[PDB]
Amino acid sequence: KVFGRCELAAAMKRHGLDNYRGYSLGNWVCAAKFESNFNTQATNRNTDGSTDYGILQINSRWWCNDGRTPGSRNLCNIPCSALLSSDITASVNCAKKIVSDGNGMNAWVAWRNRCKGTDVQAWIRGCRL
Ligand SMILES: [Cl-]
Ligand code: NI
């Protein structure tokens, strides 16, 4: 599913990401925009042989099992395919574990490079939340 900006903002709000660990909703929408272009089916292979999955590009080395990443820790205890669903629940729940892990949203390279320090509330402007 390719979400609209406001549609995704609302879904993330309903799943409790607004101000989760202090990160306002626009941070999460911004990260999703630049990680996946709001596409739940997005996949991208990394140099180390792991793959990133879904709207928040969650990596198979640490967070989910894709059956082809040796030494995967699978900390979210889910198959990576679950992160590609039109229902964002699994991605949100796993993301809550990641952002609690120590480096906050810096775990998402696109967030650090393209969202951090910018006016992220622009991402939720105009939306009925
Ligand atoms: Cl933090
Ligand atoms: Ni990545």
Side-chain angles (χ1 to χ4, degrees), residues 22-34 105-106 109-125:
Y23 290 94
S24 62
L25 193 59
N27 285 284
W28 298 100
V29 178
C30 186
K33 170 67 184 178
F34 296 123
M105 287 197 74
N106 294 293
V109 180
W111 179 82
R112 176 169 59 77
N113 289 331
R114 309 185 66 180
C115 301
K116 185 181 187 176
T118 70
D119 171 20
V120 292
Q121 292 295 99
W123 290 98
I124 60 170
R125 266 176 214 151

Side-chain angles (χ1 to χ4, degrees), residues 1-87:
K1 175 177 176 161
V2 185
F3 277 82
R5 177 176 64 86
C6 292
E7 182 187 17
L8 180 62
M12 281 176 160
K13 186 163 181 192
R14 184 170 75 86
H15 285 97
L17 280 182
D18 186 17
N19 287 304
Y20 189 81
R21 283 281 170 143
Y23 290 94
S24 62
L25 193 59
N27 285 284
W28 298 100
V29 178
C30 186
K33 170 67 184 178
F34 296 123
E35 290 289 354
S36 69
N37 209 22
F38 300 145
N39 182 5
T40 66
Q41 299 194 71
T43 63
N44 290 291
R45 194 95 188 247
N46 302 311
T47 58
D48 66 8
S50 66
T51 301
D52 295 343
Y53 294 88
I55 202 138
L56 286 168
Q57 290 290 279
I58 292 172
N59 180 267
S60 63
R61 187 165 292 288
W62 305 103
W63 305 107
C64 63
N65 180 34
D66 68 5
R68 69 171 191 194
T69 308
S72 176
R73 298 192 58 182
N74 195 10
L75 300 168
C76 291
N77 202 34
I78 44 168
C80 300
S81 62
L83 302 172
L84 301 182
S85 173
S86 56
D87 186 322

